[PDB]
Scaffold this active site. Sequence first.
Site, PDB file in Angstrom:
ATOM      1  N   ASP A  90       0.749  -1.223   0.000  1.00 32.08           N
ATOM      2  CA  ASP A  90       0.000   0.000   0.000  1.00 32.08           C
ATOM      3  C   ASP A  90       0.789   1.288   0.000  1.00 32.08           C
ATOM      4  OD1 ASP A  90      -1.523  -2.392   1.152  1.00 32.08           O
ATOM      5  OD2 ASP A  90      -3.031  -1.018   1.865  1.00 32.08           O
TER       6      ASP A  90
ATOM      7  N   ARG B 137     -13.959  -9.867   0.565  1.00 32.84           N
ATOM      8  CA  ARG B 137     -14.617  -8.754  -0.118  1.00 32.84           C
ATOM      9  C   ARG B 137     -14.854  -9.193  -1.554  1.00 32.84           C
ATOM     10  NH1 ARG B 137      -9.248  -4.840   0.991  1.00 32.84           N
ATOM     11  NH2 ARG B 137     -10.151  -3.911   2.880  1.00 32.84           N
TER      12      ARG B 137
ATOM     13  N   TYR C  34     -13.066  -1.778  -1.954  1.00 33.68           N
ATOM     14  CA  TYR C  34     -13.541  -0.579  -1.313  1.00 33.68           C
ATOM     15  C   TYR C  34     -14.775  -0.016  -1.947  1.00 33.68           C
ATOM     16  CZ  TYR C  34      -9.477   0.139   1.685  1.00 33.68           C
ATOM     17  OH  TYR C  34      -8.534   0.058   2.682  1.00 33.68           O
TER      18      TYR C  34
END
Lengths: 388, 388, 388, 388
Positions: D70, D290, D325
């Site tokens: 990240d 996710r 996200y």
Amino acid sequence: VEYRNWSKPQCQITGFAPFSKDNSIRLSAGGDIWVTREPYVSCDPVKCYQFALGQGTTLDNKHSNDTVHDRIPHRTLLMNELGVPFHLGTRQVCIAWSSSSCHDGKAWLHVCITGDDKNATASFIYDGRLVDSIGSWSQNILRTQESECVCINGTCTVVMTDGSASGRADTRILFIEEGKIVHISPLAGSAQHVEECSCYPRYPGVRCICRDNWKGSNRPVVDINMEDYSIDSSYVCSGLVGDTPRNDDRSSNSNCRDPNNERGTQGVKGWAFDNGNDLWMGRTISKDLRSGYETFKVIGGWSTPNSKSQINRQVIVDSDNRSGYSGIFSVEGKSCINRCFYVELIRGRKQETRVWWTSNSIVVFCGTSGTYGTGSWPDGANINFMPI
Amino acid sequence: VEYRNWSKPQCQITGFAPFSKDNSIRLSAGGDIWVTREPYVSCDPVKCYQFALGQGTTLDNKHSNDTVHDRIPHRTLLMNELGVPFHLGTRQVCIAWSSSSCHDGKAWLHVCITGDDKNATASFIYDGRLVDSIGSWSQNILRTQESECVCINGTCTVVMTDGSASGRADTRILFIEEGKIVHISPLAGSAQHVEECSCYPRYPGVRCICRDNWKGSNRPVVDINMEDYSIDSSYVCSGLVGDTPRNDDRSSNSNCRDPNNERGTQGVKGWAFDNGNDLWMGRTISKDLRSGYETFKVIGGWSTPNSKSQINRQVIVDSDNRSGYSGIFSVEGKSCINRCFYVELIRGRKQETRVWWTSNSIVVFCGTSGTYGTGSWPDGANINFMPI
Amino acid sequence: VEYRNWSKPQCQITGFAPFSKDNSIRLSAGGDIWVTREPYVSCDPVKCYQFALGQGTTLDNKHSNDTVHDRIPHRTLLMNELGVPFHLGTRQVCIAWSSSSCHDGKAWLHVCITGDDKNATASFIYDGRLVDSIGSWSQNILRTQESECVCINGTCTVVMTDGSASGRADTRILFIEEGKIVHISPLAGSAQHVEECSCYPRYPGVRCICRDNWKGSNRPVVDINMEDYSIDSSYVCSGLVGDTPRNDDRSSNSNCRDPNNERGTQGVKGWAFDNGNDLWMGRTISKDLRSGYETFKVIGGWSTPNSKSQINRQVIVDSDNRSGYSGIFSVEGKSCINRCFYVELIRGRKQETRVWWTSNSIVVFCGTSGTYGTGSWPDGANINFMPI
Amino acid sequence: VEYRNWSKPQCQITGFAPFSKDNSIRLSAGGDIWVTREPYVSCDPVKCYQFALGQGTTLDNKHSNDTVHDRIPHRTLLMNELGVPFHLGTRQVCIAWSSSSCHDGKAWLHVCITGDDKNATASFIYDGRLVDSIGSWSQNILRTQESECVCINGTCTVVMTDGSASGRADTRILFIEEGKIVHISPLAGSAQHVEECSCYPRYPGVRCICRDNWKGSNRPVVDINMEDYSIDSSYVCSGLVGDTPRNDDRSSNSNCRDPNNERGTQGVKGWAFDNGNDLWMGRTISKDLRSGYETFKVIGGWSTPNSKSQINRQVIVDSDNRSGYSGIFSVEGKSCINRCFYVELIRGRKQETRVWWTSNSIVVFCGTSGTYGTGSWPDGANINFMPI
Ligand SMILES: *[C@@H]1O[C@H](CO[C@H]2O[C@@H](C)[C@@H](O)[C@@H](O)[C@@H]2O)[C@@H](O[C@@H]2O[C@H](CO)[C@@H](O[C@@H]3O[C@H](CO)[C@@H](O)[C@H](O[C@H]4O[C@H](CO)[C@@H](O[C@@H]5O[C@H](CO)[C@@H](O[C@H]6O[C@H](CO)[C@H](OS(=O)(=O)O)[C@H](O)[C@H]6NC(C)=O)[C@H](O)[C@H]5NC(C)=O)[C@H](O)[C@@H]4O)[C@@H]3O)[C@H](O)[C@H]2NC(C)=O)[C@H](O)[C@H]1NC(C)=O
Ligand SMILES: *[C@@H]1O[C@H](CO)[C@@H](O[C@@H]2O[C@H](CO)[C@@H](O[C@@H]3O[C@H](CO[C@H]4O[C@H](CO)[C@@H](O)[C@H](O)[C@@H]4O)[C@@H](O)[C@H](O[C@H]4O[C@H](CO)[C@@H](O)[C@H](O)[C@@H]4O[C@H]4O[C@H](CO)[C@@H](O)[C@H](O)[C@@H]4O)[C@@H]3O)[C@H](O)[C@H]2NC(C)=O)[C@H](O)[C@H]1NC(C)=O
Ligand SMILES: *[C@@H]1O[C@H](CO)[C@@H](O[C@@H]2O[C@H](CO)[C@@H](O[C@@H]3O[C@H](CO[C@H]4O[C@H](CO)[C@@H](O)[C@H](O)[C@@H]4O)[C@@H](O)[C@H](O[C@H]4O[C@H](CO)[C@@H](O)[C@H](O)[C@@H]4O[C@H]4O[C@H](CO)[C@@H](O)[C@H](O)[C@@H]4O)[C@@H]3O)[C@H](O)[C@H]2NC(C)=O)[C@H](O)[C@H]1NC(C)=O
Ligand SMILES: *[C@@H]1O[C@H](CO)[C@@H](O[C@@H]2O[C@H](CO)[C@@H](O[C@@H]3O[C@H](CO[C@H]4O[C@H](CO)[C@@H](O)[C@H](O)[C@@H]4O)[C@@H](O)[C@H](O[C@H]4O[C@H](CO)[C@@H](O)[C@H](O)[C@@H]4O[C@H]4O[C@H](CO)[C@@H](O)[C@H](O)[C@@H]4O)[C@@H]3O)[C@H](O)[C@H]2NC(C)=O)[C@H](O)[C@H]1NC(C)=O
Ligand SMILES: *[C@@H]1O[C@H](CO)[C@@H](O[C@@H]2O[C@H](CO)[C@@H](O[C@@H]3O[C@H](CO[C@H]4O[C@H](CO)[C@@H](O)[C@H](O)[C@@H]4O)[C@@H](O)[C@H](O[C@H]4O[C@H](CO)[C@@H](O)[C@H](O)[C@@H]4O[C@H]4O[C@H](CO)[C@@H](O)[C@H](O)[C@@H]4O)[C@@H]3O)[C@H](O)[C@H]2NC(C)=O)[C@H](O)[C@H]1NC(C)=O
Ligand SMILES: *[C@@H]1O[C@H](CO)[C@@H](O[C@@H]2O[C@H](CO)[C@@H](O)[C@H](O)[C@H]2NC(C)=O)[C@H](O)[C@H]1NC(C)=O
Ligand SMILES: [Ca+2]
Ligand SMILES: [Ca+2]
Ligand SMILES: [Ca+2]
Ligand SMILES: [Ca+2]
């Protein structure tokens, strides 16, 4: 800015002049160019744009394999200035496997359709914002124009249908102000089956020449009264006939009222426009396949049942080359409003088999009141130099 | 906005300063760059654009093979800001294998020519719309300027010819207002054969130095009276002579009136402009091949029969490097209007044989009233690093 | 529009905040990115642009081999918005192997230099047009700033030199209005050799910290009086010293007046700016090689001979990574005018040998009066993933 | 221009309509497309833009290997018009491995964060200029929204946190006028841990639904009083719960006041917005991973402790496809202000192992008060056709 009301005489035209060609398939063998289909060009009051339904991939990409399918979630409406091809910096304006775009004078309206066949959804994007939406009324592939919608004084009108392909279907004409569906009117009159309208302003109305997929080779006509929201439909009078399959000119007919029932089933998107009692129109040169493209005037083609008197013919793509869909677009001139058209030159599967993709390029011509010569402007890609 | 009337003295110049170079062929060995030829640069009242006739393909594309041919249906007029090269996001402004573009102050006019040799068609696109067209009057390759047209007070004038290459031909000068051909005037005066005019404003007229393809090595001159539409033609006085083939300076002549008949046949597009009785001009350094490019002033070059007094010579491309066409362009300055020129550096077939394509890059210089040094600015691509 | 007169206090700054990084070399291993060197960023009154001297080629191109050479006819000044890298749609603004660009409020001025070493020519392009030019006064590589020029009330001033590299040379400061050289002033004061000035507005004057290539490690200072065209020159007082080679801080000196003669010969373009009697400056972390980059304030660094009191140091590129040239740029703020800088991170030959090209990427920081942390932002390309 | 004050009723919505999809990963197998993550779309008063944190590389680049991380110095905030993908001509607006951007009516503000984890720095770029900065207050990864910030009457507010991931942390809400931090307010109220706020105007306040990374599966709520700079925080009432991991609907709870402590640790950025006492929200379909994304209204979801009455559910990405996200964005409509959302579809490592990169594409939907159908719009790339 002010809204377009298109109140100017149609220009008198002599035939068509070359206008643009983007060369997308030749370029795709040495560049990252989008795989597309169902192109159209619409034009705002200062310039023109070419649109197409992308297949969410570029041609020299393994994801181009099997792009023959008309509906996948990855199709987006691409929008560029006429002449700049669909390279990677092209904007994907919305998710859509069916569309129609038009500009009311003040901003662009795009009607994009995606979703499940049986339960599709149409979004009305106007000026950037999503202003409305509508779901599938007959649970069987909601579809629209695939060419420009037209707006007079603020109201834009698109015609859409949901239902059987070659069978009866439910066609409605929506009237929309600033992205908002303000009225829906069902199809009325003689037409039996409307698919892909090529509409154009004919102040104070709008007129469309569409595709009959069930019982015709002659083309449906849909007339919209922008003041009462009244619809009317007919078939083009001309005995020369615009759909493909078609019979051939010796054995072909149209009585201006009913599907002629001569090789009815299926079609191809096409266009035509009236000029007094005459008709300017285009069609594939082949009556079986969508190959070659020709245009001509048909004396009495608009007003007399079965008139087959042709004149001013022009070959736009010779019979040995492929064409595809075609549609009309109107540009406001100083004095009158002119009519122009594009013709999709599809390449790839299923007809050409070396490659595993399906895509198109465009060529577009505009009406002229001057002189012109002759030519043939095909796609141009040598199928043996293409990837896949 | 208002129309350009070009009424400002020509700037006094001392010679030429470097202005742009786009490096298209070096870049093509590591990028998707268009294959072109017949480039030119025209300039609107705020900025300049480079134009070229694309071959509907990129260089590292199998479709670049055999692009030596000057006319195919896939040629389009590419338009970009001067300095940004012809990459895939470049706009194809129209279908054309011959063109001329100019801006009248208020918008751009492009005259694009496509079609069959024997029956070509020219479209007059102005401000986006196709406003007019004209067909081939002599059934043998209708052609035009291949460089900027010029407009004074609203009227633009282009000169075009249809007929034999090396033989007599039919040349007419069209005057056009907003895309519309408002008058056509046939060539009058001494010139025997006009091909590729390099025209420039010379308020209140327009003057062109063209190519004589039949009987000359000296360059035709075409004078247009924008008020009466009267034409006049001559040959440039200078005994130094701008065409290629050419004799050589010892054995060369021009009497300002007739084709000199010294190595007549063929040419190359070139330019020249007057300055009092002097002449500023450029030509290939070779008299046989279009290699190298040089410019100089010829004292009395404009007004005296056969004057060969040179001064202020500059090498723009050394004799060991290739050049091609060349043309002039004018930019309005604060005080006066300056003259600038571009020179096409063609590469590929038939002269260079490793590769199977033919393409060009450009270099452009502008007049200067200041000082300058020396240099040579060729294309730069090493032929052994190119594809094909 | 109105002209920039830069009459606002310099902002009080605490140090530097990250501002941009374009990542050109990492991107070049998967994209068609230009080979460049000598980058700089200048900024018009609404946005900023990054500039660089391209080598007329892209990195994954065989023409990138041997791009270590600083002068070839194919170098052009590339101009893009800060942050968009030099991809193929980048504009080549002029032919130049040395440049300086600035915006006077109303339009951009670019001074591009090309030509033969011994007889180079500089063109002054303003607002699109070529407005002037000048030839090499000492027949030995006419050169300029390689960073932004500055304009106050209409007049822009660039400083240029022609002469020996490590030897005496001829430096002149040209004042130019709208592209036109309106005055030339020779270098006056204590400075012995000026190369690559990093100039900045210091209303009503302009101040530059340049490179001394003959006898110094301390940096020349050139002060321009925009009202009398008077020049003055000195050396930066600080004993900490900005050039590379440099001695090291224990053994280094500057007396504000003469070249310190400590590792004189050669340099690297750098910058510094005054703040009262203090000095904000940057330099390579190495004193031998141009590796790493650090910035700090030197208390009394501006006004006291040999002051070596450092504070607020920041590492911008760690010592294990390469840097290159660096220069300053000023942006008008609401209240004051701030100073920012870029640092070129060159990669390739001669230092890195795997590859045969030489190119750079940039990182840029701007002054801040707020708080900041720590970091190191190098080029980032893994030399083993690069082509060649 | 004037500042946005967002004082218009929220539009009444029926559910969500398709809006955009950029198809970045399918395109990356035949094009030079940036590797990104943490996308968001913000929208100025005329059009919308998509943003993402690039990894300083393109996908078919060897530098894409190991982009799962990240934070690296090479991450930049990319900004493009919604729908045009991150190709090489995309602008890198600032250095940032965490961001938030918003437009106050008059210009854009971007808060970019880079640096060392333990000593990061945030720059406030407004209208092009760097206007302020702030350093890491808790020495442990200063981070922000990763979606749009909102501005009412000139003041923009971003919420940022520095501290432990799954542990207590220091969250502050900065208020900023024209790039300048004018006030900082610490988090007050019931929320235990705020990470990634999805904020939206709710005139005269701003409301955010954030991520609780320590003790929750229910989502934090942060309420900002733009007039007093007072903060308040809660948890969303709904017993249906938006974070991932989550329990499952039978065993899940929220009392609107405390972290529910059911699978607390970790999260994923999400959103939700109130409508009277109801709640519109979205979440992954999976409660562990996710994957998939669904939206629905929860009757009483906003005001009643543990309400689990769902209605108007829509699948945006089916459970067999990956999501990531998600965040909200608001667009001013003629009559009311609408809410829309994007959902990041990440691909690559660590979940998909064939390839060594990690990247995402986006799909975005907007609220509609009309009708809609059904569908699933995943990323679409076949992992076996991708490079690496
Ligand atoms: C740029 O463009 C140019 C030109 O472009 C046109 O190009 C093509 C490709 C188009 O499609 C366009 O797109 C374009 O506009 C290109 O230049 C051309 O490139 C060609 C190569 O691709 C080159 O060669 C041509 O290519 C054609 C197709 O590619 C062929 O048609 C042509 O040959 C044909 O005739 C042959 C007749 O002999 C035939 O050959 C067969 O081969 C064997 C050889 O051994 C024959 O007989 C031998 O056979 C047996 C053993 O097999 C016995 O052997 S032995 O003796 O016992 O040992 C026999 O006894 C023995 N024969 C004897 C003793 O005689 C066999 O019989 C033949 N077969 C038959 C059925 O007869 C072949 O099959 C073809 O039918 C030839 O290959 C072009 O010449 C070239 N043109 C130019 C001007 O150069 C460029 O390449 C591109 N590309 C680039 C990069 O620029
Ligand atoms: C350079 O470029 C120009 C411009 O493009 C081009 O001129 C155009 O030529 C075409 C092709 O001939 C013209 O179109 C034809 O027009 C005739 C009608 O016009 C003639 O007859 C009427 C009276 O009927 C006169 O008033 C008029 O002056 C003309 O003499 C049509 O009949 C043509 O259609 C038939 O021919 C087509 C092919 O050309 C067929 O595909 C079509 O199906 C029609 O055939 C049927 O009918 C025939 C009898 O009617 C019959 O014989 C057949 O067997 C079949 O049953 C066509 O529309 C066009 O009008 C010209 N346009 C203009 C503005 O002049 C030049 O020809 C070109 N020159 C060169 C060397 O390339
Ligand atoms: C740095 O850069 C500058 C600027 O580019 C450059 O200056 C320029 O040099 C060129 C090349 O010499 C100059 O151009 C020549 O000009 C002469 C005429 O000028 C002279 O003579 C007149 C009187 O006649 C004087 O008033 C004046 O002061 C000069 O003394 C021309 O004669 C030249 O043409 C001949 O030479 C060419 C090659 O140079 C040939 O190709 C051409 O065909 C001509 O040759 C023929 O005529 C000759 C006799 O006339 C004969 O001997 C030959 O055999 C043949 O028959 C040419 O135009 C130019 O004017 C300069 N420009 C300016 C503004 O000064 C510097 O030279 C350069 N320095 C370096 C080191 O690179
Ligand atoms: C998080 O990020 C922040 C912001 O980036 C960072 O703060 C900054 O730290 C740097 C590095 O220490 C600070 O810069 C140093 O400043 C001192 C002077 O300040 C001190 O002393 C004065 C009095 O002299 C006090 O008023 C003041 O309060 C301080 O106590 C300089 O001396 C430093 O220079 C020397 O050190 C450099 C390396 O740090 C050397 O490269 C340099 O050559 C200097 O060395 C020489 O002098 C030394 C004695 O003077 C001697 O010991 C050596 O051997 C040699 O001879 C340097 O400029 C900077 O000011 C801070 N900035 C601000 C705004 O606070 C945090 O450190 C960072 N935290 C983490 C964990 O990363
Ligand atoms: C074409 O496209 C349209 C538009 O997308 C689509 O309509 C939508 O369908 C969905 C899916 O069924 C609808 O959403 C469901 O709504 C019900 C509540 O509404 C009903 O009941 C209330 C009273 O309670 C009535 O007032 C109302 O008229 C309806 O009769 C919810 O209960 C649904 O949630 C449950 O089902 C989900 C899956 O559908 C589960 O994932 C979810 O967890 C919920 O399950 C739990 O509760 C159930 C009992 O409550 C229990 O049985 C389960 O085991 C579990 O415990 C869901 O929100 C949506 O509202 C429709 N939208 C609109 C505007 O009409 C069409 O279906 C579609 N057609 C085709 C052929 O594709
Ligand atoms: C050519 O165009 C210029 C530019 O408009 C004309 O200039 C105007 O003419 C007079 C004074 O010259 C006034 O109408 C205006 O003040 C001038 N324009 C500007 C912008 O100052 C000029 O008259 C035209 N000349 C010819 C011969 O047509
Ligand atoms: Ca049919
Ligand atoms: Ca000749
Ligand atoms: Ca030195
Ligand atoms: Ca959690």
